[PDB]
Amino acid sequence: DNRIKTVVILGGGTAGWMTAAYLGKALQNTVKIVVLEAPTIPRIGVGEATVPNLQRAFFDYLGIPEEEWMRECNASYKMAVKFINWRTPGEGSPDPRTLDDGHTDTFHHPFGLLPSADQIPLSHYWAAKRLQGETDENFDEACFADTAIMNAKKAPRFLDMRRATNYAWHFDASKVAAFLRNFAVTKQAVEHVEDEMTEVLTDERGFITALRTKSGRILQGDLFVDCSGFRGLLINKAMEEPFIDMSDHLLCNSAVATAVPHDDEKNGVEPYTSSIAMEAGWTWKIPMLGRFGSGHVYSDHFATQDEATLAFSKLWGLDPDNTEFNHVRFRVGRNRRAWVRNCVSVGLASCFVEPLESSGIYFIYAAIHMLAKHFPDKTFDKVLVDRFNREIEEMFDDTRDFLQAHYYFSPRVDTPFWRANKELKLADSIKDKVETYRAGLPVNLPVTDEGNFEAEFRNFWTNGSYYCIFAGLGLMPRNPLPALAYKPQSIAEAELLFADVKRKGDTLVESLPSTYDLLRQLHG
Amino acid sequence: DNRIKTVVILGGGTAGWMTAAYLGKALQNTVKIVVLEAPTIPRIGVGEATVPNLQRAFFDYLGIPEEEWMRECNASYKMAVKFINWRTPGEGSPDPRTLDDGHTDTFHHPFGLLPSADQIPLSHYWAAKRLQGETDENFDEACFADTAIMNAKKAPRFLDMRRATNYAWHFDASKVAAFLRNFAVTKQAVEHVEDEMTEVLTDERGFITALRTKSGRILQGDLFVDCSGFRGLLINKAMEEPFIDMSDHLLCNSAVATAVPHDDEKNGVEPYTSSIAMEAGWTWKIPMLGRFGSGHVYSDHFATQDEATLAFSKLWGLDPDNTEFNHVRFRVGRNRRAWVRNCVSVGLASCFVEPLESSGIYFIYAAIHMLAKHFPDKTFDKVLVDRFNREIEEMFDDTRDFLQAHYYFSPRVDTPFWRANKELKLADSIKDKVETYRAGLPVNLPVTEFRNFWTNGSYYCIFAGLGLMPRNPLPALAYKPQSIAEAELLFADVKRKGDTLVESLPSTYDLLRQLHG
Ligand SMILES: Cc1cc2nc3c(=O)[nH]c(=O)nc-3n(C[C@H](O)[C@H](O)[C@H](O)COP(=O)(O)OP(=O)(O)OC[C@H]3O[C@@H](n4cnc5c(N)ncnc54)[C@H](O)[C@@H]3O)c2cc1C
Ligand SMILES: Cc1cc2nc3c(=O)[nH]c(=O)nc-3n(C[C@H](O)[C@H](O)[C@H](O)COP(=O)(O)OP(=O)(O)OC[C@H]3O[C@@H](n4cnc5c(N)ncnc54)[C@H](O)[C@@H]3O)c2cc1C
Ligand SMILES: [K+]
């Protein structure tokens, strides 16, 4: 028996409890699992929006039904990230300014795939018509019925729970953690130790043999998962793995966050995350029943904590002194290696980018999934460790590049922040994709239809997502896809798809309940 | 109007007529298409086995139904490539020698997809049991019902045309070409010019403007497709694009081929291609109704034409002097760039490897598909041309590496040929895949494509078939007793499906005889 017998998980945030719950299922009770978390060292407390594979790839693997976890964490529905004032200069406002060309400064990044005609995605037929003056429709409204549904604040499900569109989730991060702790302890025999780690004990090769707690107790193990957060107490401190800082790709390094009570009866509930541009970064809005989570993300090199806090307060008309604020400074980048010896980093201890496209919790279940697949025995085959590390580095660097694109192609130059973005160098892979887009070619054409996690993880950002961000920001191909000049029957087939999107939007904008009404049913 | 108005295709083999037919459909009669071919300069004449995406990716785009084209080219069913005598030393025989362990030296590469349990393919559950002494079944027999069906020479369809398994096609290459000529001329307004090209006319920028024919005809065009074959009359000669020779990856560079009449009533028809190992390469067998195509592929550095011809003749017991033989010397590698200025190479003019896994016709429809997607206007955007060239180079290098693996992991050391294979440099991508396999991890896990066409199941078929095993089972299996048990049901389902189907299916012979009237 050369097997791992005990797994010790340091940290009890979303990362630790997601790791405990998942490994509990994957390892089928052949391994002891221990979570060491100090209740006195708080979880980061933010991490409130997600992507659509969360239910398929995570809660379904654990056999937890969507309605059960949503009810426990005051969850709401997310059909997109909505970008506001990313093209026009001035102070932060929740209200979109007007472009030179008369359009409102909003674009959507919704989920689910573009239809295609003659093997060409709808994006490319839209771009031809728009470059040729045959349409003044935005990419988002022409190519996704989700846009019309979001504009009307309608739910992605009917009241009897049949599905209308693709969606993701908004939720309370701390309640998701608590719900997962309860699951892991009562249903998967996970041992919960509430104490502080004071020592990391190693053998002659620098492999971890145990953690000591403040109370003197020693937890032995064969595999340690560092979910300690930004501190990286195992991967960075004990194991001395360097963190590769990547503020030369993205500038934000700070956030100030609160929860804002909300008249849902008056305003309705937005089924989307808003990314509201600011002078020195942007501000998230994550609606739930009764309130929305908000946070101004910023570079402390271009705003002081006090400056960011005031602009954030002004945005929502908050009193800066009778308002509770959570202040965070964050690393941007990844460990040189996520997994060193018998230490695997997961969550903020591994890697991080601004929450601009809700990538954090996805990084956690992607890592856990890859750990389950690459799960070692005590020989720790170096090839297993290398393949795991390679998956983590490509997943991160892909998403980092996609995020950089959101900033580098903002036309805003009104503040030193917005100008500073244009001074940063693009990575090669994102330059290559821009040149592809600019020639009218598709970028990362999606592989399957909606339907299987591994079948999405490869290249997570598809053609539709590049179009949402490039075209949303006003970067267009130089010319239409030249093949369209030879394909009049395919132009016409695409006109039926544009009409199908309009009809589905109009029909569903009429029949669907408000997000408010679906939430009110869901939460009793 | 900046558009291409006339496309001229040089060559009337499978490449030219596939190009004409496909572009005919893709370009929706916005473009004049001309095929210039000399009846007096023959087709390569071979190119008789395929892979399963042929119907999806080609005949379906043309709206031609499977039965219609099969009937016109004497087509038969291919459920695998069957490797014979690739592990044991000696002369070429069609009969499998006996391995050290007592079983026959045969393994299959079938197209059936592997089921999985707890997101792990059946390959890995097989490998665990085999490395731990818990099974004596080979990978192919344990993991695919297709193996039992092929051993019984049964068809991959019932007589009522319901599908049993995945499969590809065998066919007469010249009849496929003729059927496609007829389609292109009568249904897609393609002009067929029967003449020999003598000059390629270029403008001051080195772009082609027209081809001049022996009879003094000038064919003007905006875009030229070189389907001239190994000659590469446009891409290599006129356009001066260098061919990157890759005999440092694969040694074979020659073939001697014939067609052999066959008693189908007596022997039945094998629903597979056979790759029969020889002293200085291998010999294909491609069955159809009434005959099989065969050819000994070889390195001329390790056998003379006469040596290869004798061994090939001995194999089938042919009289070397009252037997018609097609002798070919072939390029191995690709053009530095497949598309230069307004010249696009397709087929043997583009790139080539030995027909070990029936990759030739796939290179044609993959290229044509990519040309339709990257179709230029007269500005010939440099980025469109570069992205096309990149897709061709990844498609080719993927398949080249997969082929190299068939040779580098043969245990045979009995001839200088088989030893010389161990001396060749492995490409980085195939070294990386071997290291992945050896750690028990999957290689290119399937999804439900042209640049990772060869999946986990195909790597297992070749590695495990040749006797290369992972070092140890996938370690995660040691923690998953419920998944081991779920996999036992799938092994039992393969056995049961094989037994059931081996009983209910018609013979390949009988399905062919129904199909061809
Ligand atoms: C501003 C911000 C916004 C974000 N927004 C999103 C979003 O919208 N969507 C999204 O998907 N992700 C988001 N993320 C990322 C997401 O929040 C994280 O991936 C997720 O919250 C998990 O964090 P964690 O568990 O790794 O770390 P933490 O929550 O910091 O957990 C650290 C744990 O380690 C324990 N610990 C520390 N030291 C010791 C010790 N010595 N002994 C014992 N225990 C110890 C603590 O007690 C705690 O339990 C955001 C992150 C930030 C910073
Ligand atoms: C030994 C061997 C085995 C193969 N086996 C397989 C297989 O099993 N499966 C598979 O999928 N593929 C296979 N292939 C590849 C496959 O045969 C080819 O991709 C395809 O069938 C034919 O290629 P082609 O049409 O480019 O060239 P060719 O058939 O050589 O055609 C060349 C054309 O150019 C014309 N031409 C040349 N010069 C002139 C001129 N000056 N004027 C006018 N016309 C001219 C000729 O008339 C002819 O029409 C094999 C290839 C070889 C060599
Ligand atoms: K290469």
Numbering used by the authors:
A (entry chain A): 2 to 452, 457 to 529
B (entry chain B): 2 to 449, 461 to 529
In the authors' words:
Flavin‐dependent halogenases (FDHs) mediate the regioselective halogenation of a variety of natural products including antibiotics and anticancer compounds. Flavin‐dependent halogenases require reduced flavin adenine dinucleotide (FADH2), O2, and halide salts to halogenate their substrates. We observed a similar phenomenon in Thal (also known as ThdH), a tryptophan 6‐halogenase from Streptomyces albogriseolus involved in the biosynthesis of thienodolin. We describe the crystal structures of the tryptophan 6‐halogenase Thal in complex with FAD or with both tryptophan and FAD.
Because our attempts to cocrystallize Thal with FAD failed, we soaked crystals of apo‐Thal with FAD and NaCl or with a combination of l‐Trp, FAD, and NaCl resulting in the FAD‐Thal and Trp‐FAD‐Thal structures, respectively. The FAD‐Thal structure contains FAD with an occupancy of 0.9 in both chains. In all structures both active sites are empty, FAD binds to both monomers with high occupancy and the FAD loop is closed. Upon switching from the open to closed state, Pro40 undergoes a peptide flip and Glu49, the other flanking residue, flips its side chain by almost 180° as in PyrH. There are structural differences between FAD‐Thal and Trp‐Thal outside the FAD loop and the substrate‐binding loop. Gly13 undergoes a peptide flip so that in FAD‐Thal, the NH of Gly14 rather than the O of Gly13 points toward the FAD phosphates. Val52 and Pro53 move into the tryptophan‐binding site by 0.6 Å–1.1 Å. Thus, subtle structural changes in the tryptophan‐binding site might be directly coupled to the binding of FAD. The side chains of Ser360 and Tyr366 adopt other rotamers. In FAD‐Thal, Tyr366 forms a hydrogen bond to the side chain of Asn54, which also interacts with the carboxylate of Glu461.
